[PDB]
């Protein structure tokens, strides 16, 4: 899961 | 109402602004709507409770830390501020008003939570455990991460957290349903589609987009069919961003992307809910496609669809309008219960080929308890195998003739996997009557003589039974 | 009725060569792209190998890359796996389908290759  | 004397409001345009080219918050707030009562969480890398612009809106009830299991959200400090993700979230909802620091949140009255989760293993159950915290306490959960933006993912919810998604919207706020912000992603570079992305897909979920101060789609941005509205964020270098706290105690005005636009939404929310706290969770939704507003929003594939509402893929139906929402909340007659109708569509697999249609007249279930006239979401769930999936672009047709893109094709995703009954979701139809004829386009888009096969198509229906339009 | 039939596997020993075939009847048999999956005990459905309508058209998994060669023949409906270097890891119940999900009838019985 990657940081918007 | 007076205006925030903070020293960093007049950089908040977003808020502040007088160029009619805003969030219209200042009309919320001038009618009485600054966010009191409301609770709003942060699922993120931390936040720091103890920033001078959060102290005093801080809710531990509303925090917790899943990663290591304690009640303590505070980020992991490292050399290059690695988590400073969650708190510059927190500020744009939060951050306190009139107290000489920083900026102001949109909802600078609201408390405001941080569930410490993206820093470790981020398993099924660490998200089940985020997005089910303490759901009679948190009104709004925010949440600007997703999978991998590179345009050839696909991925959503395991088990545990479409199990925690559905209880919070069955159980949360007493039965009225959490409410779920998300951002729909940063891929644009790389021409992501943010249908491929579960999180932001859900029904459950309101996925917001992003604008740049000039009103132009950002370069950051996914186009989708599931994306419902939009808030201003950063654009190119001649264009302002967005002002907010920092780690270490600090203020930036460099915060960027869909991240910043989900907690913009989930402000603005805020102040919808204190409005009318019996909204239900699907009550928002349907504020928000009625109030949004397309105008000075520059895209190339505005649409007006069945019901007469201009929709777009890169923006939904539009910017948010807080002053039109929370004017709106005030008399707003709760929605009928949620029904749901589904469609299994395929006798027979089907060849893909250059161009695929298939089509299906229905009834929507007449004659059935779940029975609907007026839509609200609708998914088209596929099973298709092909030898090159980003080749493929998919589009649906309801009867009155909104086309929604459901794919457009992916340059970088040069995968074998196909989809395995992947619920591509449209908001576009949303108050459109569902009976009669859909049809589903699969185009191949390349020149290659790509291949594969068709072997699930169910279309499933969201909505009520009411009058005509 | 609509019928995908597997046969050819067998023991074979490590480094050798085993020929799949599946008979299709039932429907216009090149009507459809055509699909080897395989199912390995206690493991998913793993994709091995793809090819279009006609034959012009063939994909593989990396797996079995430079070691499978999958054909077909539409005037006698019936779809090739030429399996070679055969290794311990390719034991698995192998089926013939018109989709990669697909379910019977649409997918095949199986036909088991030991190594
Ligand atoms: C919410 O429900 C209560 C309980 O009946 C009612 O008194 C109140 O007027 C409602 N609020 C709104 C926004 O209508
Ligand atoms: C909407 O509700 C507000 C708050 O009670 C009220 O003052 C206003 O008159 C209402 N508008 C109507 C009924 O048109
Ligand atoms: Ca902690
Ligand atoms: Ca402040
Ligand atoms: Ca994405
Ligand atoms: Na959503």
Request: proline share 4%; hydrophobic share 35%.
């Amino acid at each position: 899961r990657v940081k918007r | 109402y007076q205006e925030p004397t903070d020293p960093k409001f007049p950089q908040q345009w977003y808020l502040s602004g007088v160029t009619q080219r805003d969030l219209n918050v200042k009309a919320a707030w001038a009618q009485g709507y600054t966010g009191h009562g409301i609770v709003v969480s942060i699922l993120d890398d931390g936040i720091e409770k103890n920033h001078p612009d959060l102290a005093g809106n801080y809710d531990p009830g509303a925090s917790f830390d899943v990663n290591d299991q304690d009640p303590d959200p505070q980020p992991r400090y490292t050399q290059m501020n690695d988590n400073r993700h969650g708190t510059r979230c927190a500020g744009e909802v939060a951050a306190v008003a009139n107290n000489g620091v920083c900026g102001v949140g949109v909802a600078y009255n609201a408390r405001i939570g941080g569930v410490r989760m993206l820093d470790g293993e981020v398993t099924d159950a660490v998200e089940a455990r985020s997005l089910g915290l303490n759901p009679n306490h948190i009104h709004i959960y925010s949440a600007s991460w997703g999978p991998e933006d590179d345009g050839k993912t696909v991925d959503g919810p395991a088990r545990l957290a479409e199990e925690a998604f559905f209880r919070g919207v069955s159980q949360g706020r007493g039965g009225l349903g959490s409410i779920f912000v998300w951002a729909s992603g940063n891929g644009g570079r790389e021409h992501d589609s943010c249908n491929c992305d579960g999180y932001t897909n859900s029904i459950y979920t309101l996925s917001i987009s992003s604008a740049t101060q000039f009103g132009n789609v950002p370069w950051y941005s996914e186009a989708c069919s599931s994306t419902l509205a939009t808030t201003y964020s950063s654009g190119n270098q001649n264009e302002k961003q967005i002002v907010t706290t920092d780690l270490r105690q600090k203020c930036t005005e460099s915060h960027t992307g869909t991240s910043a636009s989900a907690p913009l939404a989930a402000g603005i929310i805020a102040l919808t809910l204190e409005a009318n706290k019996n909204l239900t969770w699907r009550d928002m939704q349907h504020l928000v496609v009625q109030t949004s507003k397309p105008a000075h929003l520059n895209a190339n594939d505005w649409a007006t669809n069945g019901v007469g509402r201009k929709v777009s893929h890169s923006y939904g139906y539009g910017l948010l309008d807080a002053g039109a929402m929370v004017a709106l909340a005030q008399n707003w007659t709760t929605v009928a219960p949620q029904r749901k109708c589904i469609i299994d569509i395929l006798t027979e697999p089907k060849d893909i080929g250059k161009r695929l249609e298939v089509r299906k007249t229905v009834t929507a279930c007449l004659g059935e308890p779940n029975h609907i006239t007026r839509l609200e979401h609708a998914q088209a769930r596929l099973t298709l195998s092909y030898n090159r999936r980003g080749d493929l672009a998919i589009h649906l047709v309801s009867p009155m003739g909104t086309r929604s893109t459901l794919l457009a094709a992916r340059p970088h995703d040069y995968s074998a996997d196909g989809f395995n009954d992947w619920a591509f979701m449209t908001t576009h139809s949303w108050d459109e009557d569902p009976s009669g004829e859909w049809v589903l386009e699969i185009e191949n888009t390349s020149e290659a003589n790509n291949y594969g096969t068709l072997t699930k198509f169910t279309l499933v229906l969201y909505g009520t039974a009411s009058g005509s339009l | 009725q609509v019928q995908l039939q597997e046969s050819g596997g067998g023991l074979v020993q490590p480094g050798g060569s085993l020929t799949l075939s599946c008979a299709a009847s039932g429907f216009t048999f090149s009507s459809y792209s055509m699909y080897w999956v395989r199912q390995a005990p206690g493991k998913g459905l793993e994709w091995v190998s793809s090819i279009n309508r006609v034959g012009s058209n063939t994909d593989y998994a990396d797996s079995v890359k430079g070691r499978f060669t999958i054909s077909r023949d539409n005037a006698k409906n019936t779809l090739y796996l030429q399996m070679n270097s055969l290794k311990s890891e390719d034991t698995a119940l192998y089926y013939c389908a018109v989709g990669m999900y697909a379910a019977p009838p649409w997918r095949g019985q199986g036909t088991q290759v030991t190594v």
